[PDB]
From a paper:
[name] is a de novo designed protein consisting of two α-helices and five β-strands. [name] is a de novo designed protein whose amino acid sequence has no evolutional trace. Because of the lack of an evolutional trace, [name] is an ideal model protein to study the pure nature of protein structure. The high stability of [name] also provides a suitable property for protein engineering.
We introduced [name], [name], and [name] mutations and the resulting mutant was named Top7sm1 (sm indicates surface mutations). We mutated these two residues to serine and called this mutant Top7sm2. We scrutinized the crystal packing of Top7sm2 and found Ile68 at β-strand-4 to be a promising site for the mutation. We mutated Ile68 to arginine to introduce repulsive electrostatic force by positive charges and steric hindrance at the interface. We successfully determined the crystal structure of Top7sm2-[name] with a resolution of 1.4 Å. The crystal belongs to the P21 space group, containing two molecules in the asymmetric unit (mol-A and mol-B). As intended, the mutant formed new crystal packing without forming the continuous β-sheet string that was observed in the other [name] structures, and the R values (R/Rfree: 0.20/0.24) were dropped to a relatively decent range for the resolution. Arg68 slid by each other to avoid steric crash and repulsive electric force, as intended. Although there is no direct contact at [name], [name], and [name], these mutations seem to prevent steric crash with a neighboring molecule by the removal of the long Lys and Gln side chains. [name] and [name] mutational portions directly form a crystal contact with the Glu28 of a neighboring molecule.
Numbering used by the authors: 0 to 95
Amino acid sequence: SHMDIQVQVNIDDNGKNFDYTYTVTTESELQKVLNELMDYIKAAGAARVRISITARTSSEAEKFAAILRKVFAELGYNDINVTFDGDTVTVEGQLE
Ligand SMILES: [Mg+2]
């Protein structure tokens, strides 16, 4: 339903790639999933990460953008780009 939040994750590490799709119901559940992704990226290293979140309003897209900017900064990415398509925010990070 439209109460759901959709999360798309692409973790691409010099040819070792992974793709995840999640449906989360609250900001709290979104944060749970993002913290698991951070755990994985910190342990394994990922050269490129792209996370897209389809929020429920345009204001919530910006709220989730702020969460993602902080995630990517905490993970140490050196090229971080935030884009919006409707209510969907995408953030892509790379080490170079
Ligand atoms: Mg879990």
